[PDB]
Amino acid sequence: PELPEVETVRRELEKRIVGQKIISIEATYPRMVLTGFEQLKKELTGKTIQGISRRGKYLIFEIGDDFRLISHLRMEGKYRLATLDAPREKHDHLTMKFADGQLIYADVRKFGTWELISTDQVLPYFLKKKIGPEPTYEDFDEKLFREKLRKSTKKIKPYLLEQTLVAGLGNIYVDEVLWLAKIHPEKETNQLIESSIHLLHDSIIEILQKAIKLGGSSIRTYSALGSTGKMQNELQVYGKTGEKCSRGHGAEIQKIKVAGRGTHFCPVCQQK
DNA sequence: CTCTTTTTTCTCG
DNA sequence: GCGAGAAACAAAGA
Ligand SMILES: [Zn+2]
């Protein structure tokens, strides 16, 4: 997932598991708990979930006053809420059991991670990762953004993916954003002029907030939280190779590889 | 059979 | 520091 999908999951969990006491925690893949599964089981068992937050693509479970469980779903992680007698599925790895249901984490590729940290360590955790601002008009300052782009000869798509200019873009929404802002993904950032950077800044905010409003992009429906999204029906370029650009000049969307990633763009709208 | 494809961190030169 | 490439891992498709 990217930020809109994680925010969608966050909202669903907030409605369903806040106020619930954790009765037990069980793992079939304890190695994804990077701070140690037995420690996490010992500390969180019997605690009540107080809230669910998010920073960038990270989910933050607030559990008791003093603990934060930071979860990253990486490429394929999925949460679902099930009854206590639901059968195990092949790629289920962790479960938090409540009195009347359980929260199950599944991840086919085993990339997702859980980290238990203290409340007063959450802000340092994200500072150490150098995560950039949230994609909102209030937090995402164009002036700093502009200065960072000016100092770099990185290509704009990979620099946006780093999460340091702004948090939350992944491959789908960086392709959508650069098409909307009419910028080629291999454009060196120090060549962008002020008006392009302004359009890019606003396009990042608008695309991600639209995606959040529509419940994220679900390339299929699942048993899992966040699988009811509708943003996938609004994508203009991601996965649209060979289809016509929707601005209607008859150009086909093309797919290239940029810094190892599949990259979809309109060669008329997005000139190098 | 092999190769390629689908977030963050790691290696190497 | 940089960029390129690969790796953690699993499954599907060519
Ligand atoms: Zn176009």
CSV table of C-alpha atoms (C1' of nucleotides) and ligand atoms in Angstrom, one decimal:
chain,number,residue,atom,x,y,z
A,1,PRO,CA,0.0,0.0,0.0
A,2,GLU,CA,0.8,3.7,-0.3
A,3,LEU,CA,-0.4,6.5,2.0
A,4,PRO,CA,-4.0,6.5,0.8
A,5,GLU,CA,-4.4,2.8,1.4
A,6,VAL,CA,-2.7,2.9,4.8
A,7,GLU,CA,-5.0,5.9,5.8
A,8,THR,CA,-8.0,3.8,4.7
A,9,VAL,CA,-6.9,0.9,6.8
A,10,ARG,CA,-6.2,3.3,9.7
A,11,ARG,CA,-9.7,4.7,9.6
A,12,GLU,CA,-11.3,1.2,9.5
A,13,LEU,CA,-9.3,0.0,12.5
A,14,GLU,CA,-10.0,3.2,14.4
A,15,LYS,CA,-13.7,2.4,14.2
A,16,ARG,CA,-13.5,-1.2,15.1
A,17,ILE,CA,-10.6,-1.9,17.5
A,18,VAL,CA,-10.2,1.2,19.6
A,19,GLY,CA,-11.1,0.5,23.2
A,20,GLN,CA,-10.5,-3.3,22.8
A,21,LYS,CA,-8.3,-5.1,25.3
A,22,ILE,CA,-5.7,-7.5,23.8
A,23,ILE,CA,-6.3,-10.9,25.2
A,24,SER,CA,-3.4,-12.6,23.5
A,25,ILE,CA,-0.9,-12.2,20.7
A,26,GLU,CA,0.2,-15.2,18.5
A,27,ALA,CA,2.8,-15.5,15.7
A,28,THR,CA,3.6,-18.0,13.0
A,29,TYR,CA,6.2,-15.6,11.6
A,30,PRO,CA,7.7,-13.9,14.7
A,31,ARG,CA,10.7,-12.7,12.8
A,32,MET,CA,8.8,-9.8,11.3
A,33,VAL,CA,8.6,-8.2,14.8
A,34,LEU,CA,11.9,-6.4,14.5
A,35,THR,CA,12.1,-5.4,18.2
A,36,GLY,CA,11.5,-9.0,19.2
A,37,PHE,CA,8.2,-11.0,19.3
A,38,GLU,CA,8.5,-12.3,22.9
A,39,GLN,CA,9.1,-8.8,24.2
A,40,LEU,CA,6.1,-7.5,22.2
A,41,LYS,CA,3.9,-10.3,23.5
A,42,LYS,CA,4.9,-9.7,27.1
A,43,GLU,CA,4.4,-6.0,26.9
A,44,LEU,CA,1.1,-5.7,25.0
A,45,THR,CA,-0.9,-8.6,26.3
A,46,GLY,CA,-3.7,-7.3,28.5
A,47,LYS,CA,-3.3,-3.7,27.2
A,48,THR,CA,-6.1,-1.7,25.6
A,49,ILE,CA,-5.9,-0.1,22.2
A,50,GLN,CA,-6.3,3.6,22.6
A,51,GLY,CA,-6.0,4.9,19.1
A,52,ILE,CA,-4.5,4.3,15.6
A,53,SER,CA,-2.4,6.9,13.9
A,54,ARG,CA,-0.3,7.1,10.7
A,55,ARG,CA,2.9,8.8,9.5
A,56,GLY,CA,3.7,8.4,5.8
A,57,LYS,CA,3.0,4.8,5.0
A,58,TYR,CA,3.5,3.6,8.6
A,59,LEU,CA,0.5,2.6,10.8
A,60,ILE,CA,0.9,3.5,14.5
A,61,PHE,CA,-1.1,1.5,17.1
A,62,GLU,CA,-1.4,3.4,20.4
A,63,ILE,CA,-1.6,0.7,23.0
A,64,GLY,CA,-1.7,1.8,26.6
A,65,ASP,CA,-0.2,5.2,27.4
A,66,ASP,CA,3.4,4.2,26.9
A,67,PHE,CA,3.6,1.9,23.8
A,68,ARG,CA,3.4,2.4,20.1
A,69,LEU,CA,3.3,-0.5,17.7
A,70,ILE,CA,4.7,0.8,14.3
A,71,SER,CA,3.6,-1.3,11.4
A,72,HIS,CA,4.7,-1.1,7.8
A,73,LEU,CA,2.7,-3.2,5.3
A,74,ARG,CA,5.4,-2.8,2.6
A,75,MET,CA,4.3,-4.4,-0.8
A,76,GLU,CA,1.5,-6.8,0.1
A,77,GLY,CA,0.6,-6.6,3.7
A,78,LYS,CA,-3.1,-6.9,4.6
A,79,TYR,CA,-5.0,-6.7,7.9
A,80,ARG,CA,-8.4,-8.3,8.5
A,81,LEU,CA,-10.8,-8.6,11.4
A,82,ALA,CA,-12.1,-12.1,11.8
A,83,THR,CA,-14.1,-14.1,14.3
A,84,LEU,CA,-12.1,-16.1,16.9
A,85,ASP,CA,-12.7,-19.4,15.2
A,86,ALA,CA,-11.7,-18.3,11.7
A,87,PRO,CA,-9.4,-20.8,10.0
A,88,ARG,CA,-5.7,-20.0,9.4
A,89,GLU,CA,-4.8,-18.9,5.8
A,90,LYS,CA,-1.4,-19.7,4.3
A,91,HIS,CA,0.3,-16.3,4.6
A,92,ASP,CA,-1.2,-15.2,7.9
A,93,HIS,CA,1.7,-14.3,10.2
A,94,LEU,CA,0.5,-12.5,13.4
A,95,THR,CA,-2.7,-12.2,15.2
A,96,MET,CA,-4.0,-9.9,18.0
A,97,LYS,CA,-6.9,-11.7,19.7
A,98,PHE,CA,-9.6,-9.7,21.4
A,99,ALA,CA,-12.5,-11.1,23.5
A,100,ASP,CA,-14.8,-11.1,20.4
A,101,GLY,CA,-12.7,-11.2,17.3
A,102,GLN,CA,-9.0,-11.0,16.2
A,103,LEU,CA,-6.9,-8.8,14.0
A,104,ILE,CA,-4.8,-10.9,11.6
A,105,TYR,CA,-1.8,-9.6,9.6
A,106,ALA,CA,-1.0,-11.5,6.4
A,107,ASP,CA,1.8,-10.8,3.9
A,108,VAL,CA,2.7,-13.1,1.1
A,109,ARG,CA,6.1,-11.7,0.6
A,110,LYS,CA,7.0,-11.4,4.3
A,111,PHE,CA,8.3,-7.8,3.8
A,112,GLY,CA,6.1,-6.0,6.4
A,113,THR,CA,7.4,-5.2,9.8
A,114,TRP,CA,6.2,-4.6,13.4
A,115,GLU,CA,8.3,-2.5,15.9
A,116,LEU,CA,7.4,-1.8,19.5
A,117,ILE,CA,8.5,1.5,20.8
A,118,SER,CA,7.9,3.8,23.6
A,119,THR,CA,5.6,6.8,23.2
A,120,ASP,CA,8.4,9.3,23.6
A,121,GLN,CA,10.5,7.5,21.0
A,122,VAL,CA,8.0,7.8,18.1
A,123,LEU,CA,9.0,11.3,17.0
A,124,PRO,CA,12.7,10.3,17.1
A,125,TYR,CA,12.0,7.1,15.2
A,126,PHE,CA,10.6,9.1,12.2
A,127,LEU,CA,13.3,11.8,12.5
A,128,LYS,CA,16.0,9.0,12.2
A,129,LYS,CA,14.3,7.8,9.0
A,130,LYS,CA,14.3,11.3,7.6
A,131,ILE,CA,10.6,11.0,6.6
A,132,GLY,CA,9.4,14.2,4.9
A,133,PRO,CA,6.3,16.2,5.6
A,134,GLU,CA,2.7,14.8,5.3
A,135,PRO,CA,1.1,15.7,1.9
A,136,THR,CA,-1.2,18.4,3.2
A,137,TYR,CA,-1.3,22.1,2.5
A,138,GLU,CA,-0.6,22.7,6.2
A,139,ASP,CA,2.5,20.5,6.5
A,140,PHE,CA,4.0,20.4,3.0
A,141,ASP,CA,5.9,23.7,2.6
A,142,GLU,CA,6.5,24.5,-1.1
A,143,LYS,CA,9.4,26.8,-0.3
A,144,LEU,CA,11.5,24.1,1.3
A,145,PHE,CA,10.4,21.6,-1.4
A,146,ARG,CA,11.6,24.0,-4.0
A,147,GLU,CA,15.0,24.5,-2.4
A,148,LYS,CA,15.6,20.8,-2.0
A,149,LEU,CA,14.8,20.3,-5.7
A,150,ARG,CA,17.1,23.1,-6.7
A,151,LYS,CA,20.1,21.5,-4.9
A,152,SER,CA,19.7,18.0,-6.5
A,153,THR,CA,20.5,16.4,-9.8
A,154,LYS,CA,18.5,13.4,-8.9
A,155,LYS,CA,15.7,12.3,-11.2
A,156,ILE,CA,12.3,13.5,-9.9
A,157,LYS,CA,10.5,10.1,-9.8
A,158,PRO,CA,13.2,8.3,-7.7
A,159,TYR,CA,13.7,11.4,-5.5
A,160,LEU,CA,9.9,11.5,-4.8
A,161,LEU,CA,9.9,7.8,-3.9
A,162,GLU,CA,12.6,8.3,-1.2
A,163,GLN,CA,9.9,9.7,1.2
A,164,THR,CA,12.2,12.6,2.1
A,165,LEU,CA,10.7,15.5,0.1
A,166,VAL,CA,7.2,14.4,1.1
A,167,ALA,CA,5.9,11.3,2.7
A,168,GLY,CA,3.5,8.7,1.2
A,169,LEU,CA,4.0,8.4,-2.6
A,170,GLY,CA,4.7,5.0,-4.0
A,171,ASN,CA,4.8,3.8,-7.5
A,172,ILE,CA,1.1,4.2,-8.4
A,173,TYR,CA,0.7,7.7,-7.1
A,174,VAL,CA,4.1,9.0,-8.2
A,175,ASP,CA,3.2,8.0,-11.8
A,176,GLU,CA,-0.2,9.6,-11.4
A,177,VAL,CA,1.2,12.8,-9.9
A,178,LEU,CA,3.9,13.3,-12.5
A,179,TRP,CA,1.3,12.8,-15.3
A,180,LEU,CA,-1.0,15.3,-13.7
A,181,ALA,CA,1.8,17.8,-13.2
A,182,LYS,CA,3.1,17.2,-16.8
A,183,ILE,CA,6.6,16.3,-15.7
A,184,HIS,CA,8.8,13.5,-17.1
A,185,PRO,CA,9.9,11.0,-14.4
A,186,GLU,CA,13.6,11.2,-15.5
A,187,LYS,CA,13.6,15.1,-15.3
A,188,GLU,CA,16.6,16.2,-13.1
A,189,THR,CA,15.1,18.1,-10.3
A,190,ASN,CA,17.4,21.1,-10.6
A,191,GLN,CA,16.0,21.7,-14.0
A,192,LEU,CA,12.4,22.2,-12.8
A,193,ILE,CA,11.2,25.8,-13.0
A,194,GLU,CA,9.2,27.5,-10.2
A,195,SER,CA,5.8,27.1,-11.9
A,196,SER,CA,6.4,23.4,-12.6
A,197,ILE,CA,7.4,22.9,-8.9
A,198,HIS,CA,4.2,24.7,-7.8
A,199,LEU,CA,2.0,22.5,-10.0
A,200,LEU,CA,3.9,19.4,-8.7
A,201,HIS,CA,3.5,20.4,-5.1
A,202,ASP,CA,-0.3,21.0,-5.4
A,203,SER,CA,-0.7,17.8,-7.6
A,204,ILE,CA,0.9,15.7,-4.9
A,205,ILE,CA,-1.6,17.0,-2.3
A,206,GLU,CA,-4.6,16.8,-4.6
A,207,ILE,CA,-3.9,13.3,-5.8
A,208,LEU,CA,-3.3,11.8,-2.4
A,209,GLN,CA,-6.2,13.6,-0.8
A,210,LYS,CA,-8.5,12.4,-3.6
A,211,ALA,CA,-7.2,8.9,-3.2
A,212,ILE,CA,-7.9,9.0,0.6
A,213,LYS,CA,-11.5,10.3,-0.1
A,214,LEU,CA,-12.1,7.4,-2.5
A,215,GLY,CA,-10.8,4.7,-0.1
A,216,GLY,CA,-7.5,4.1,-1.9
A,217,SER,CA,-6.8,1.9,-4.9
A,218,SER,CA,-7.7,-1.7,-4.6
A,219,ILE,CA,-6.6,-3.7,-7.7
A,220,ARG,CA,-8.9,-6.3,-6.3
A,221,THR,CA,-11.4,-6.8,-3.5
A,222,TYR,CA,-10.3,-9.0,-0.6
A,223,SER,CA,-11.4,-10.2,2.8
A,224,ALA,CA,-9.0,-7.5,4.0
A,225,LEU,CA,-9.4,-4.0,5.4
A,226,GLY,CA,-9.1,-1.3,2.7
A,227,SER,CA,-10.2,-3.5,-0.2
A,228,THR,CA,-13.3,-1.4,-0.8
A,229,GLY,CA,-11.5,1.4,-2.5
A,230,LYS,CA,-12.5,3.2,-5.7
A,231,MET,CA,-9.4,5.2,-6.6
A,232,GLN,CA,-8.4,2.5,-9.1
A,233,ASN,CA,-11.2,3.7,-11.4
A,234,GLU,CA,-9.6,7.2,-11.4
A,235,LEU,CA,-6.0,6.2,-12.4
A,236,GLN,CA,-4.9,7.9,-15.6
A,237,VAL,CA,-1.6,6.2,-16.3
A,238,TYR,CA,-0.5,3.6,-13.8
A,239,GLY,CA,-1.0,0.2,-15.5
A,240,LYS,CA,-2.5,1.9,-18.6
A,241,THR,CA,0.3,1.0,-21.0
A,242,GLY,CA,-1.0,1.2,-24.6
A,243,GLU,CA,-4.2,3.0,-23.7
A,244,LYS,CA,-4.7,6.5,-24.9
A,245,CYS,CA,-3.8,9.5,-22.7
A,246,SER,CA,-7.0,10.8,-21.3
A,247,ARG,CA,-6.2,14.4,-22.3
A,248,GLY,CA,-7.1,13.1,-25.8
A,249,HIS,CA,-4.2,13.9,-28.1
A,250,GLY,CA,-4.1,10.3,-29.2
A,251,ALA,CA,-0.8,9.5,-27.6
A,252,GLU,CA,-0.5,6.0,-26.0
A,253,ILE,CA,0.7,5.6,-22.4
A,254,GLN,CA,4.2,4.1,-22.5
A,255,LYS,CA,6.0,2.0,-19.9
A,256,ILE,CA,9.7,2.4,-19.2
A,257,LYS,CA,12.0,1.4,-16.3
A,258,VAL,CA,13.3,4.2,-14.2
A,259,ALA,CA,15.8,3.4,-11.4
A,260,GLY,CA,14.4,-0.2,-11.4
A,261,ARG,CA,10.8,0.7,-11.3
A,262,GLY,CA,8.0,0.2,-13.8
A,263,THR,CA,7.1,3.7,-14.9
A,264,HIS,CA,4.0,4.8,-16.9
A,265,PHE,CA,3.8,8.2,-18.7
A,266,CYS,CA,2.3,10.1,-21.6
A,267,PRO,CA,5.2,11.1,-23.9
A,268,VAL,CA,3.3,14.2,-25.2
A,269,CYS,CA,2.3,15.5,-21.7
A,270,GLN,CA,5.6,14.6,-20.1
A,271,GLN,CA,8.5,15.9,-22.2
A,272,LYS,CA,12.0,15.0,-20.9
B,1,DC,C1',13.6,-25.2,-16.8
B,2,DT,C1',14.8,-19.5,-16.8
B,3,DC,C1',13.7,-14.7,-16.5
B,4,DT,C1',10.7,-10.9,-15.3
B,5,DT,C1',7.3,-8.6,-12.8
B,6,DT,C1',5.0,-6.7,-8.5
B,7,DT,C1',8.7,-0.9,-0.2
B,8,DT,C1',12.6,-0.2,2.0
B,9,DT,C1',17.3,-1.3,2.9
B,10,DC,C1',21.9,-3.1,1.4
B,11,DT,C1',26.2,-3.5,-1.5
B,12,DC,C1',29.5,-2.0,-4.5
B,13,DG,C1',32.5,0.7,-7.1
C,1,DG,C1',28.3,11.1,-0.6
C,2,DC,C1',26.5,9.1,-5.6
C,3,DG,C1',23.7,5.7,-8.8
C,4,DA,C1',23.0,1.2,-10.2
C,5,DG,C1',21.6,-2.9,-9.0
C,6,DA,C1',20.0,-6.3,-5.9
C,7,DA,C1',18.0,-8.4,-1.8
C,8,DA,C1',14.5,-9.6,1.8
C,9,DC,C1',10.2,-13.0,-0.3
C,10,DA,C1',6.3,-15.4,-2.9
C,11,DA,C1',3.6,-16.2,-6.8
C,12,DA,C1',2.3,-15.6,-11.5
C,13,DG,C1',3.2,-15.3,-16.3
C,14,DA,C1',6.1,-15.4,-20.5
D,1,ZN,ZN,-1.0,13.1,-22.7
